[PDB]
Amino acid sequence: DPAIYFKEQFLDGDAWTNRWVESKHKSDFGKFVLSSGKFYGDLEKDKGLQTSQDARFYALSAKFEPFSNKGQTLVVQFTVKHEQNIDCGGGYVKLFPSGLDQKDMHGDSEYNIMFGPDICGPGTKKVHVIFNYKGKNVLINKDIRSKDDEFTHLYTLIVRPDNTYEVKIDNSQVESGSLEDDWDFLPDANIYAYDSFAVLGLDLWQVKSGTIFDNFLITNDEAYAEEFGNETWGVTKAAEKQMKDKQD
């Protein structure tokens, strides 16, 4: 049995609003809307959270029953679709410990892990993998290129209790190594371990909005995340491109 710490597919209309909390740290955060977009694999399945306002900060998050990854594997997975042809805007998630106030979450709130694609002009086309360690948020020393097209892509981070990690895009490995080698933490066997995870958050800036996020999964099972990804992103992809191609 895989431990399913968090799953979000937005399959039940407006009920997501009971699961996700808007921060009030700023009064002028942009709004997320539930949408499948202009083109999609399936109208119902491909509903997800869409940024709806240009040049805005975004702060929305969802709690789950707290857990620690000590002694086990951690997998964070979601899909990102920059349907708008983005110029500049984030597409990454943050995982927060139990202490976070969801009503006051912002860019500088303390987080454990930040993972996902970031785009800001041609210079920044990066997959972030950031670990909080000894009071610092440490960025991976490797260049992982993010996808920049209009289509749905799957992002997966795997963190294992032997201090190894793996990044997959579209369910295929793009980067791999050990935590000791690929970040400047600098023989600590417990770097990977955090005492709690309790909230997943979207803390973004976007110029051109319209990004859609879907199919969030936090789990301890690599094989399951891979299956879920094929059942999810893997079914979206071909039908989505078909519909877009139809659209001259």
Ligand X SMILES: OC[C@H]1O[C@H](O[C@@H]2[C@H](O)[C@@H](O[C@@H]3[C@@H](O[C@H]4[C@@H](O)[C@H](O)[C@@H](CO)O[C@@H]4O)O[C@H](CO)[C@@H](O)[C@@H]3O)O[C@H](CO)[C@H]2O)[C@H](O)[C@@H](O)[C@@H]1O
Strands 56-67 and 136-139: unpaired
Residue 161 contacts by C-beta under 8 Å, 6 or more apart in sequence? Answer: 69, 70, 71, 72, 73, 192, 193
Q: Does 237 contact Ca ion by CB under 5 A?
A: no
224 annotated as ligand-binding: no
Break-preceding residues in the chain (C–N over 2.5 Å): 186
The DSSP element (H or E) to which 164 belongs, if any, is: strand 164-169
Tell the smallest beta-carbon distance from residue 74 to ligand X (Å): 19
Spell out, one character per residue from 20 to 59, where the chain touches Ca ion: x when CB under 5 A holds, - when not: ---------------------------xx-----------
Tell the smallest beta-carbon distance from residue 49 to ligand X (Å): 16
CB nearer ligand X, residue 140 or residue 218: 140
The DSSP secondary structure of 95-127, one letter per residue, reads: EE-TT--GGG--TTS--SEEEEEEEETTTEEEE
Tell the smallest beta-carbon distance from residue 132 to ligand X (Å): 8
Q: Which does 235 bind (CB under 5 to 8 A by kind): Ca ion, ligand X, none?
A: none
Name the residues that contact ligand X, by CB under 6 A: 57, 88-90, 107, 114, 118, 120, 124, 137, 203-205
CB nearer Ca ion, residue 34 or residue 144: 34
Q: Would you say 139 and 130 are in contact if contact means Cβ atoms under 8 Å apart? A: yes
7 annotated as ligand-binding: no
As a whole number of Å, the CA-based R_g of the chain is: 17
The DSSP secondary structure of 37-93, one letter per residue, reads: -SS-S-TTTT-EEEE-SSSEEEEEEEEEEEE--TTS-EEEEEEEE-TT--SEEE--E
Residue 18: count of CB within 10 angstroms of its CB: 8
List binders of Ca ion among 138-157 (CB under 5 A): none
Q: Does 214 contact Ca ion by CB under 5 A?
A: yes
Tell the smallest beta-carbon distance from residue 224 to ligand X (Å): 28
Q: Does 9 contact Ca ion by CB under 5 A?
A: yes
> Can you say how many angstroms the Cα of residue 51 is from the centroid of all Cα atoms in its chain?
14
CB nearer ligand X, residue 68 or residue 124: 124
203 annotated as ligand-binding: yes
Q: Which does 47 bind (CB under 5 to 8 A by kind): Ca ion, ligand X, none?
A: Ca ion
Give the chain's length. 248
Residues that bind Ca ion (CB under 5 A): 9-10, 47-48, 214
Q: What residue numbers does the annotated binding site for Ca(2+) cover? A: 9, 45, 47, 214
